Nucleic acid binder design. Structure first.
Length: 185
RNA sequence: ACUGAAACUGUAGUAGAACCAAUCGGGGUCGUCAAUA
């Protein structure tokens, strides 16, 4: 049982997304910038509607990103001037141009949940495939969810933790966690 | 790769109960005084 991971270096974010786009289809992105943490959704093709401008670094731009869908997750972090390391995590063996494949054996993987911030807002956003949670603590949170949220729905980010031996003594740990999807409970 | 936000150590509770500032006492009445030569 292997967790496959694919790594590329000195690559810009928008190139990293494009180089992965056949796998990141419909992925939720979480982009990290000095001023904003924003969710995005890639097209079912995997593109983003302002991709270059959205993923540009040089003007308070994206220094870290995570893209996740059912099959895989892309991670990117800026090393210098908007060029940085991409790692894609997938439980499936897959081919990528330029990415060096690796793998980790893991003993088992276990489901985990994270409750998202907020209750369903009294109306969803005007954008299709978006919903609004809100909590007085943070205000609105627009999430790329296509289910119309019922009152007293709660949204959970589901993840899978991979457990492996860290020591030659046999000590186990969770070696990584892959984010999967938003789910309504 | 960037300070969280916002939140009254307040709310109720009598320094009080008990203890006599009191007990006894006719506003009365008679023998001297002094020490030397």
């Amino acid at each position: 049982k292997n967790l496959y991971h694919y790594h590329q270096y000195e690559i810009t974010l928008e190139s990293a997304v494009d180089s992965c786009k056949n796998h990141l289809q419909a992925a939720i992105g979480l982009l990290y910038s000095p001023q904003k943490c924003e969710l995005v959704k890639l097209d079912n093709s995997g593109k983003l509607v302002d991709s270059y401008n959205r993923l540009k670094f040089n003007n308070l731009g994206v220094f870290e990103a995570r893209f996740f869908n059912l099959n895989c997750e892309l991670r990117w972090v800026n090393e210098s001037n908007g060029n940085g390391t991409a790692v894609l995590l997938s439980e499936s063996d897959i081919t990528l141009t330029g990415f060096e494949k690796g793998l980790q054996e893991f003993i088992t993987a276990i489901d985990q949940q994270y409750l998202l911030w907020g209750e369903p807002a009294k109306h969803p956003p005007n954008a299709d495939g978006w919903q609004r949670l809100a909590e007085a603590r943070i205000g609105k949170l627009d999430i790329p969810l296509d289910n119309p949220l019922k009152p007293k729905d709660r949204v959970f980010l589901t993840s899978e933790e991979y457990i492996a031996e860290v020591d030659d003594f046999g000590n186990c740990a969770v070696i990584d966690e892959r984010l999967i999807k938003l789910e309504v409970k």
